[PDB]
Design a protein around this ligand. Structure first.
Ligand SMILES: [Mg+2]
Ligand SMILES: [Mg+2]
Ligand SMILES: [Mg+2]
Ligand SMILES: [Mg+2]
Ligand SMILES: [Mg+2]
Ligand SMILES: [Mg+2]
Ligand SMILES: [Mg+2]
Ligand SMILES: [Mg+2]
Ligand SMILES: [Mg+2]
Ligand SMILES: [Mg+2]
Ligand SMILES: [Mg+2]
Ligand SMILES: [Mg+2]
Ligand SMILES: [Mg+2]
Ligand SMILES: [Mg+2]
Ligand SMILES: [Mg+2]
Ligand SMILES: [Mg+2]
Ligand SMILES: [Mg+2]
Ligand SMILES: [Mg+2]
Ligand SMILES: [Mg+2]
Ligand SMILES: [Mg+2]
Ligand SMILES: [Mg+2]
Ligand SMILES: [Mg+2]
Ligand SMILES: [Mg+2]
Ligand SMILES: [Mg+2]
Ligand SMILES: [Mg+2]
Ligand SMILES: [Mg+2]
Ligand SMILES: [Mg+2]
Ligand SMILES: [Mg+2]
Ligand SMILES: [Mg+2]
Ligand SMILES: [Mg+2]
Ligand SMILES: [Mg+2]
Ligand SMILES: [Mg+2]
Ligand SMILES: [Mg+2]
Ligand SMILES: [Mg+2]
Ligand SMILES: [Mg+2]
Ligand SMILES: [Mg+2]
Ligand SMILES: [Mg+2]
Ligand SMILES: [Mg+2]
Ligand SMILES: [Mg+2]
Ligand SMILES: [Mg+2]
Ligand SMILES: [Mg+2]
Ligand SMILES: [Mg+2]
Ligand SMILES: [Mg+2]
Ligand SMILES: [Mg+2]
Ligand SMILES: [Mg+2]
Ligand SMILES: [Mg+2]
Ligand SMILES: [Mg+2]
Ligand SMILES: [Mg+2]
Ligand SMILES: [Mg+2]
Ligand SMILES: [Mg+2]
Ligand SMILES: [Mg+2]
Ligand SMILES: [Mg+2]
Ligand SMILES: [Mg+2]
Ligand SMILES: [Mg+2]
Ligand SMILES: [Mg+2]
Ligand SMILES: [Mg+2]
Ligand SMILES: [Mg+2]
Ligand SMILES: [Mg+2]
Ligand SMILES: [Mg+2]
Ligand SMILES: [Mg+2]
Ligand SMILES: [Mg+2]
Ligand SMILES: [Mg+2]
Ligand SMILES: [Mg+2]
Ligand SMILES: [Mg+2]
Ligand SMILES: [Mg+2]
Ligand SMILES: [Mg+2]
Ligand SMILES: [Mg+2]
Ligand SMILES: [Mg+2]
Ligand SMILES: [Mg+2]
Ligand SMILES: [Mg+2]
Ligand SMILES: [Mg+2]
Ligand SMILES: [Mg+2]
Ligand SMILES: [Mg+2]
Ligand SMILES: [Mg+2]
Ligand SMILES: [Mg+2]
Ligand SMILES: [Mg+2]
Ligand SMILES: [Mg+2]
Ligand SMILES: [Mg+2]
Ligand SMILES: [Mg+2]
Ligand SMILES: [Mg+2]
Ligand SMILES: [Mg+2]
Ligand SMILES: [Mg+2]
Ligand SMILES: [Zn+2]
Lengths: 174, 204, 140, 37
RNA sequence: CGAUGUCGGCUCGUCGCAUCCUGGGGCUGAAGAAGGUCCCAAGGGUUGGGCUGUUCGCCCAUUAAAGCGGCACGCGAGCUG
RNA sequence: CGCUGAAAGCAUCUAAGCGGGAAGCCCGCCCCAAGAUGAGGCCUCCCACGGCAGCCGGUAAGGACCCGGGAAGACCA
C-alpha cells in the first residue's frame, strides 16, 4: 500500500549515482538520467536504491511514489530494457523494415514511413507484427502510440494497428 | 536571394508553343557592386548595386568619394538587394534563366488626388431616382454618438499611386544578354522608363 | 527660516543585478532611486535621483502562472488594433521591456516622470556599456 | 463528450477525475464521458 | 419640448458570437456516403431575381453557405423620401 | 487525443515531466515607418575663417532661388 517506500532492487552490474536534482543509471544497455525533485532524498544501499520523503503532506506523498517508479523504470531499462509489440490486422495491411525505418502499408493511397528516434529500434518479425524496443520506457510507449495512431483499430472490423493484448471490441454494422 | 536593378521599357507579346504570351520587357543590367553590407560592419547582409552611368560633372564630391572607394565609374542610381552577396563585382541579367519566377518592384503610375470610386472601388450613388449631387460620393463615414468619431484607416479620397508596388511570381520568359534584356510574363508596375527591381521570387 | 532647496548635484550612477529578483518587488525600489527619495534633500519638482543601470533583466522572476497568464496590451488606434502579448513571449522577444514597463508604471505621470524614466537603463545579459560612468553596485 | 453543469457517475464503471482545472467523467462506455461546462 | 429629425432603402463600414459556411474535434440508434447532437473556432466568406413602402416573410434559380444580433431599431450638416 | 506517472499496491493525459493537435494565435508575404524626442546604423565629402555651449561677418562640403520641363502634381512636395 505504498510505492514510494518500496525498495528498488538494483541488479549487478547497473550503477546508480545520486546528484542534485537527478539520479543517473548506467547499465549493460545504456545510461538514463532521471530528474528527481530536490525535496526527495534518493538513498543508495547495497544492491538497493531507496527514496525517502521529508513529510507526509500530499505533494511529498505524490512525489514519493513517482520518484521511486521513475528510478525503478530506469533501472529496469538499462538492464532488461523495454519493448512493446504491435499487431497489424486487416487484409491488405502489412509492415516491413526499410533500412532502419518502419514502413506501414495500411490502406492509405501511400505507405507511411516512421523514422526511429535515437534509442528506439524497430523490429518486424513477421509482416503483421512490429516490435518497438528501447531503454527509455516513456519513449518506447510514445513511439508505439504514434505507430498505432497511424491507423487505429476500426470500430466495426478487426482492421488497423493494435497493441499486442489489446481486446478487439466491435460494435455492429447494419 | 538575388536581384538586379532595371528599367521598364515596354510591353508586347511573343508566341511560344502556339500561345500568345504577354510580356513586359526590362533592360536590367549591368549593375556594378558599389558597397557590400556585412554583419560585422552594418549588422545585415546586402549588396548596394549601381545602375546607369552618369555624367561625372553631375557627381558631387561625397558621391565621388563613394564611387572611388569601390573603384567604380559614376552611376545614376544606388539600390541595395537584401541578403544577396554575388561572387563577382558585376550583376547582369544572367542571374535569371528562362523558366524562373521573379518578383518585380516598381513605382506605380500616379493618379494624383483620386476619388473614392477610382481609389477604393466604392459604388458611388445612383445617377437618377432623385440622387442629389452624390453620384461619386462615399456615403456614410460612421455611426452616431457611439463612437462619435471616424476610424483610423477609413477609406477616403486622396492621393493614389506613385507608390512602391511589388508584383510577385512572374515567369521569366526570355533572357537576352547581348542587350541586357529580361522578358517577364505579365504586367509590371509603373510607366515605361520607370526604375524597377527584379528579384528571385519569394513564393515557393 | 525657509526649507532647504538643493543646488544642482552630480547624480549617482548605480548598478543592479536583476537575476533571480521578483519583477514587481525590484521595480518599486528602482522607482524610489529614480525619484531620489532615498536622499535627505529630496525635492519633488527637480530630477535629482540616481541613474539606474540594470543587468540580467531577462533573468527576472515571477510567481504563480504569470509567465503564461500575464498579458501586455497595445492599442494601435485602428479597428481591431488591440494586441495582446503574454509575459512568456515578451521575455523571448524584448525581455528588457518587462522590467522597463513595470518601472514606468510606478513613476509619476507628467514631464518630470518621463524624464526620470530616461535615467533608467535596462539590459538583458550581464553586461552594460556604461563603464565610463563607473556605476556603484547596489544590493537591494 | 457530454458537456454540462451537472456531471455525475452514470454507471458503476464511471470515474470522476479532475484534469487541468476541470471535472471530467471518464468511463469504458464512451457515452458516459463528461466534461463540466 | 429657447427641437436629441422617425420607418424602409442606398452608400459606407465596424464589432459581438448564442457559428450559416469553410478549418479542428467528442458522442451517435456513426458500415460507407450522407446526416444528427455537443465542443473549439470570429480569419475570411455569406448570390441574383418575382411580390410588397416595407423591416420581416413567402416564392423562383442557384449556392460551400445563402447566420443572427450591436453600433441613437449604426449611418438624412452623406443621398433618397 | 495521448506517453510515462503518483497521491490512492489498482486506476488516472497531471499532481513532477513529455507528445500530438484548427481557415484561428506569433512569425513568414506585401506596404508605411527613426517626431522610434528611445530622434538608430553604414559609406563618403567639408574643416581646425576672421572680429567682439554667446555674437558678427566672409567662405567650405553642399544647399536654395530662377528658368526648361515631367505617366510627379490642387498648391506645395
Ligand atoms: Mg549499487
Ligand atoms: Mg534517515
Ligand atoms: Mg522604384
Ligand atoms: Mg496625375
Ligand atoms: Mg468618388
Ligand atoms: Mg473604379
Ligand atoms: Mg483602385
Ligand atoms: Mg452603384
Ligand atoms: Mg454607378
Ligand atoms: Mg437606383
Ligand atoms: Mg430632389
Ligand atoms: Mg445630378
Ligand atoms: Mg457621402
Ligand atoms: Mg442619425
Ligand atoms: Mg467617443
Ligand atoms: Mg505622391
Ligand atoms: Mg522564348
Ligand atoms: Mg508606361
Ligand atoms: Mg532602497
Ligand atoms: Mg511575481
Ligand atoms: Mg530587443
Ligand atoms: Mg504611473
Ligand atoms: Mg496625479
Ligand atoms: Mg452508480
Ligand atoms: Mg477507466
Ligand atoms: Mg423634446
Ligand atoms: Mg439656441
Ligand atoms: Mg440649445
Ligand atoms: Mg435649435
Ligand atoms: Mg415600427
Ligand atoms: Mg452589421
Ligand atoms: Mg463558442
Ligand atoms: Mg465547421
Ligand atoms: Mg466539420
Ligand atoms: Mg462518415
Ligand atoms: Mg446509418
Ligand atoms: Mg448506413
Ligand atoms: Mg460531428
Ligand atoms: Mg461535446
Ligand atoms: Mg467537448
Ligand atoms: Mg469568422
Ligand atoms: Mg473580425
Ligand atoms: Mg461574420
Ligand atoms: Mg420588378
Ligand atoms: Mg416585371
Ligand atoms: Mg425588390
Ligand atoms: Mg421584401
Ligand atoms: Mg413593385
Ligand atoms: Mg410582411
Ligand atoms: Mg403565406
Ligand atoms: Mg448544390
Ligand atoms: Mg453541407
Ligand atoms: Mg435574397
Ligand atoms: Mg442594430
Ligand atoms: Mg428598440
Ligand atoms: Mg421598434
Ligand atoms: Mg436609426
Ligand atoms: Mg436595421
Ligand atoms: Mg439613420
Ligand atoms: Mg435630408
Ligand atoms: Mg432615412
Ligand atoms: Mg447624421
Ligand atoms: Mg445633422
Ligand atoms: Mg452628417
Ligand atoms: Mg449631426
Ligand atoms: Mg427612396
Ligand atoms: Mg411622402
Ligand atoms: Mg498509463
Ligand atoms: Mg482507489
Ligand atoms: Mg504538469
Ligand atoms: Mg507538443
Ligand atoms: Mg502539446
Ligand atoms: Mg499522439
Ligand atoms: Mg506543435
Ligand atoms: Mg487557405
Ligand atoms: Mg522603406
Ligand atoms: Mg533620424
Ligand atoms: Mg528610414
Ligand atoms: Mg513611448
Ligand atoms: Mg540619423
Ligand atoms: Mg543598425
Ligand atoms: Mg556653390
Ligand atoms: Zn459509465
Amino acid at each position: 500500500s505504498r510505492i514510494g517506500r518500496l525498495p528498488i532492487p538494483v541488479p549487478k552490474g547497473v550503477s546508480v549515482e545520486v546528484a542534485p536534482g537527478r539520479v543517473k543509471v548506467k547499465g549493460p544497455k545504456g545510461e538514463l538520467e532521471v530528474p528527481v525533485s530536490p525535496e526527495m532524498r534518493v538513498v543508495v544501499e547495497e544492491g538497493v536504491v531507496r527514496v525517502e520523503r521529508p513529510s507526509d503532506e500530499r505533494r511529498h506523498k505524490s512525489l514519493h511514489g513517482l520518484t521511486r517508479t521513475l528510478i525503478a523504470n530506469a533501472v529496469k531499462g538499462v538492464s532488461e530494457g523495454y519493448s512493446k509489440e504491435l499487431l497489424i490486422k486487416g487484409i491488405g495491411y502489412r509492415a516491413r523494415l526499410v533500412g532502419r525505418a518502419l514502413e506501414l502499408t495500411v490502406g492509405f493511397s501511400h505507405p507511411v514511413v516512421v523514422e526511429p528516434p535515437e534509442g528506439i529500434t524497430f523490429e518486424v518479425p513477421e509482416p503483421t507484427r512490429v516490435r518497438v524496443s528501447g531503454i527509455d520506457k516513456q519513449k518506447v510507449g510514445q513511439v508505439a502510440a504514434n505507430i498505432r495512431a497511424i491507423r487505429k483499430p476500426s470500430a466495426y472490423h478487426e482492421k488497423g494497428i493494435y497493441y499486442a493484448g489489446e481486446p478487439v471490441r466491435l460494435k455492429p454494422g447494419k | 536571394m538575388k536581384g538586379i536593378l532595371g528599367v521598364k521599357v515596354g510591353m508586347t507579346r511573343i508566341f511560344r508553343d502556339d500561345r500568345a504570351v504577354p510580356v513586359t520587357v526590362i533592360l536590367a543590367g549591368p549593375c556594378p557592386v558599389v558597397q557590400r553590407r556585412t554583419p560585422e560592419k552594418d549588422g545585415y547582409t546586402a549588396v548596394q548595386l549601381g545602375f546607369l552611368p552618369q555624367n561625372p560633372k553631375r557627381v558631387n564630391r561625397p558621391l565621388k568619394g563613394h564611387f572611388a572607394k569601390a573603384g567604380v565609374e559614376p552611376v545614376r542610381i544606388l539600390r541595395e538587394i537584401r541578403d544577396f552577396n554575388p561572387e563577382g563585382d558585376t550583376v547582369t541579367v544572367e542571374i535569371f534563366k528562362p523558366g524562373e519566377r521573379v518578383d518585380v518592384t516598381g513605382t506605380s503610375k500616379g493618379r494624383g488626388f483620386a476619388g473614392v470610386m477610382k481609389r477604393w472601388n466604392f459604388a458611388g450613388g445612383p445617377d437618377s431616382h432623385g440622387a442629389h449631387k452624390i453620384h461619386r460620393h462615399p456615403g456614410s463615414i460612421g455611426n452616431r454618438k457611439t463612437p462619435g468619431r471616424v476610424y483610423k484607416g477609413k477609406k477616403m479620397a486622396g492621393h493614389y499611386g506613385a507608390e512602391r508596388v511589388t508584383v510577385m511570381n512572374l515567369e521569366v520568359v526570355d533572357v537576352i544578354p547581348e542587350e541586357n534584356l529580361l522578358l517577364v510574363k505579365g504586367a509590371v508596375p509603373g510607366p515605361n522608363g520607370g526604375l524597377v527591381i527584379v528579384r528571385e521570387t519569394k513564393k515557393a | 527660516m525657509k526649507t532647504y532647496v538643493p543646488k544642482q548635484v552630480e547624480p549617482r550612477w548605480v548598478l543592479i543585478d536583476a537575476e533571480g529578483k521578483t519583477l514587481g518587488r525590484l521595480a518599486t525600489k528602482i522607482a524610489t532611486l529614480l525619484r531620489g527619495k532615498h536622499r535627505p534633500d529630496w525635492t519633488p519638482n527637480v530630477a535629482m535621483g540616481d541613474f539606474v543601470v540594470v543587468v540580467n533583466a531577462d533573468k527576472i522572476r515571477v510567481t504563480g502562472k504569470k509567465l503564461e497568464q500575464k498579458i501586455y496590451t497595445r492599442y494601435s488606434g485602428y479597428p481591431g488594433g488591440l494586441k495582446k502579448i503574454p509575459l512568456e513571449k515578451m521575455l523571448a522577444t524584448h525581455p528588457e521591456r518587462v522590467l522597463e514597463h513595470a518601472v514606468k508604471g510606478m513613476l509619476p505621470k507628467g514631464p518630470l516622470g518621463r524624464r526620470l524614466f530616461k535615467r533608467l537603463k535596462v539590459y538583458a545579459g550581464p553586461d552594460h556599456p556604461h563603464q565610463a560612468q563607473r556605476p556603484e553596485k547596489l544590493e537591494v | 463528450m457530454k458537456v454540462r453543469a451537472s456531471v455525475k457517475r452514470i454507471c458503476d464503471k464511471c470515474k470522476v477525475i479532475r484534469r487541468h482545472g476541470r471535472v471530467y467523467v471518464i468511463c469504458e462506455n464512451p457515452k458516459h464521458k463528461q466534461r463540466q461546462g
